[PDB]
Ligand binder design. Structure first.
Ligand SMILES: NC(=O)C1=CN([C@@H]2O[C@H](COP(=O)(O)OP(=O)(O)OC[C@H]3O[C@@H](n4cnc5c(N)ncnc54)[C@H](OP(=O)(O)O)[C@@H]3O)[C@@H](O)[C@H]2O)C=CC1
Ligand SMILES: NC(=O)C1=CN([C@@H]2O[C@H](COP(=O)(O)OP(=O)(O)OC[C@H]3O[C@@H](n4cnc5c(N)ncnc54)[C@H](OP(=O)(O)O)[C@@H]3O)[C@@H](O)[C@H]2O)C=CC1
Ligand SMILES: COc1cc(C[C@@H](CO)[C@H](CO)Cc2ccc(O)c(OC)c2)ccc1O
Ligand SMILES: COc1cc(C[C@@H](CO)[C@H](CO)Cc2ccc(O)c(OC)c2)ccc1O
Lengths: 290, 288
């Protein structure tokens, strides 16, 4: 009676949530167990902790193409969530080749969860374009910044915890960004992967109240701690260099506004499509850091 | 009404289990939040998943003395849990405890083969704790079950094999297999227990004292199949760098984890009959 899902990349940051949210939804959840890459003990107990919650384990190497055929034949829906910081993401081309040979897949949701690649501001679109080629029903989940990577640090780089003294502001901090608890991404991805309204579509994850400028997120923190931070404005060029952990990414989100420039309809916005998901406002999210 | 435990090494394999268990027991538990080595999602969240249970974080750096000092001044008992360079940063911690001296006990990092037996730098650390007047307890004696049970004492894997197996000697040496969670709960109980202050607490739960052959056969019975077994003897087992293979020797050929027994007054499973530890028959049902 269920939609059996296979979560590729089930032990990663975004992946492990999706496993969990799938199960919560009520899904016969499936995770891919890959030919071990060393003595990695976080990854192994993470893996086996899923079968206590209901999940099953499938064996597959990306080197072994028919292993991936065996994997995808046992499931109704694949969702991927592999590294993308990019030859990691392109492993998804092999997964597509196997899903195409199998043909029992009802929908395939690749690794997106963020900056729409279809615009101009990676090799994700390369992956979109293979899915559509083989004609695999799909759903693109895009449009949010990860709360752990962008809100908790007040968008500051090289760190993941609130600053205590001084905060860099890109531009005026009046570009509007979309900060979202990765837990809610997964829930949307889990509610959306079998919805009839979002098949073959792009799903935008723009919870309204978490549409915020930087300096507004910074005034959510300052109002929490009760201390004004020492703010330093940074203009475009003074931000352009010619390297550091992804700057071409920041710049488009925080200077160009590529995430909030085009508005979107209720028929394609996670919070509107799934109003029962009481997602998390950054005034609650930042609370763990006080 | 309760001691304050300050876990050190709180997001390491043993530490997170110790943090959870200190809270489970009911200690006002504190973790030591160390300046970012990196942008580490799984270190940062792990630390912040503790607060949500009741644990407090404390920022202190080992390149800073009164930092360590200030945090120890805040707790009754400190329990470190490090990874090797990593073991000898506990001296810097020993100088703060000593300089603070509000400390009632300090369980160093052990949880493995007791190094007292000759056959490390934990001894180095023991001699320091001791030469400083620190009450202590040395949790010692346990083979970690995730590192030696789920793989069935095979190397390079952490999950059962399917057909072939590798036996060390006659497979009739006894090794103390233990699931890490019981060590930690044993650790949570001992740290304020008058009866273990300034002792070495041993963790050899009777029913989990087994031999590889007895472990391979606990599984063999779980699957309903038998495993093509290959026996390796001493001389063939000694190479001329592969992941401390002196540990697998002393433990599986020399028997060092067992060649002596321990008064029940020093054995965790006797001091703590309430801990219903897990038998390797249960710990192994998860890989089925
Ligand atoms: N602000 C935002 O929106 C953010 C968006 N993203 C994107 O979200 C999506 C999720 O990615 P993310 O969680 O960050 O990735 P991670 O780096 O956290 O990797 C997590 C999982 O990806 C798989 N993985 C990594 N490397 C390999 C490899 N060589 N071969 C096979 N599998 C590999 C593994 O899954 P397994 O072991 O099961 O095979 C791994 O456990 C991506 O598209 C990513 O680019 C990334 C950063 C922030
Ligand atoms: N078979 C057995 O019985 C085994 C015994 N052991 C023993 O268990 C104890 C805990 O080790 P374990 O948890 O398994 O493995 P880990 O080495 O993975 O512990 C990791 C944690 O130790 C801290 N750490 C790592 N490097 C440093 C460093 N230079 N300086 C300060 N802290 C550091 C960090 O804590 P944080 O960042 O939170 O401050 C890190 O999160 C050890 O003493 C070990 O001897 C471990 C292996 C097997
Ligand atoms: C919005 O969507 C996406 C966002 C990203 C963000 C990546 C960019 O490489 C990294 C994290 O992996 C963000 C980061 C970089 C450096 C930092 O110092 C930093 O502080 C924590 C955070 C990748 C893909 C996306 O589709
Ligand atoms: C039981 O006593 C102890 C045991 C240990 C285990 C250490 C030895 O270096 C290593 C990791 O550090 C574990 C390991 C070794 C080889 C392997 O093939 C292996 O694969 C799972 C894992 C340390 C301290 C102890 O007191």
């Amino acid at each position: 009676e269920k939609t059996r899902v296979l979560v590729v990349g089930g032990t990663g940051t975004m992946g492990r949530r999706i496993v969990r949210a799938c199960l919560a939804e009520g899904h016969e959840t499936y995770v891919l167990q890959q030919p071990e890459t060393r003595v990695d003990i976080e990854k192994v107990q993470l893996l086996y902790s899923y079968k206590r919650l209901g999940a099953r384990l499938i064996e597959a190497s990306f080197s072994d193409h028919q292993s991936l055929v065996s994997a995808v034949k046992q499931v109704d829906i694949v969702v991927a969530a592999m590294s993308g910081v990019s030859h990691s993401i392109l492993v998804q081309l092999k997964l597509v080749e196997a899903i195409k040979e199998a043909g029992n897949i009802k929908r395939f949701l690749p690794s997106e969860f963020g900056m729409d690649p279809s615009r101009m501001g990676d090799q994700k679109l390369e992956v979109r374009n293979a899915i559509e080629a083989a004609g695999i029903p799909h759903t693109y989940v895009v449009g949010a910044c990860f709360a752990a990577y962008f809100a908790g640090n007040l968008s500051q780089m090289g760190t993941l915890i609130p600053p205590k003294k001084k905060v860099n502001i890109y531009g005026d901090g009046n570009v509007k960004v979309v900060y979202v608890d990765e837990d809610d991404i997964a829930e949307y991805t889990a509610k959306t992967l079998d919805d009839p309204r979002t098949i073959n579509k792009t799903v935008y994850v723009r919870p309204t109240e978490n549409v915020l400028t930087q300096m507004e997120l910074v005034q959510i923190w300052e109002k929490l701690t009760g201390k004004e931070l020492e703010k330093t404005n940074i203009s475009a060029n003074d931000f352009l260099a010619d390297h550091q952990a992804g700057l071409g990414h920041f710049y488009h989100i925080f200077y160009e506004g590529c995430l909030t420039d085009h508005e979107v309809g209720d028929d394609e916005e996670a919070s509107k499509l799934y109003p029962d998901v009481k997602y998390t406002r950054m005034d609650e999210y930042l609370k763990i850091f006080l």
